Amino acid sequence: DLWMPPPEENVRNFCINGEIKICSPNGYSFRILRHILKSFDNVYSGNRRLIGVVKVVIGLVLSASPVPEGMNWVYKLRRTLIFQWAESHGPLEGEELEYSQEITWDDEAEFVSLQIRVSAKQCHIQGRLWCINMNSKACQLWADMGLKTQQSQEDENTSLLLE
């Protein structure tokens, strides 16, 4: 099955703490998650200059295996990642992210509530490129959310963020 039943030029190093709690009485599937996040561009309430970071994080966070905590499945990610932007996209100097938002999906019988918490502070710990050593789910999620990128000509494995 695919189902999860109820619990019963500009470069930045960001220390990142990511948490998504999914709330679903009837349980949920990856398919539903992909439908929800399809429209993240038009739901995200945070700092636009940082939506690139958030999408990346949301993708990695949801590509892990969660844990049951109360009436929620809980995905946690805690990494130090390096992001590179093209042109003039991305955060201004010394700018940081403290984002949280409830996204609630509701379609007839199916009902899923996503609680997203992403914090990102600039640290001096050399971090890892977000776009290497990910898994198919991470990629699949970045594709859904329409993650805008452009390829680095220097390094093959590198993607510049366009948002």
| Tokens standing for residue 6 | 């109820």
| Tokens standing for residue 28 | 């949920």
Sign of the alpha-carbon dihedral angle for 37, 38, 40, 43: negative
Cα–Cα nearest to 6, from 68, 63, 84:
68
Q: What is the pairing mode between strands 149-151 and 159-161?
A: antiparallel
What DSSP letter does each residue of 25-90 carry, written as one string?
Answer: TT-EEHHHHHHHGGGGGGT--S-GGGHHHHHHHHHHHTTS--EEETTEEEEEEEEEEEEEE-TT-S
Stated in angstroms to one decimal place, the resolution of this structure is 2.8
Cα dist. 156→25, 68, 129, 151 in Å? 44, 39, 12, 7
3 state DSSP class of 141: helix
Instruction: Please state the separation of Cα 134 from the chain's center in Å.
Output: 12
Please, are residues 144 and 34 in contact by the beta-carbon 8 Å criterion? yes
Beta bridge partners of 15: 80, 121
Domains of the chain, CATH where assigned: 1-163 (3.10.460.20)
3 state DSSP class of 128: strand
| Tokens standing for residue 4 | 């999860």
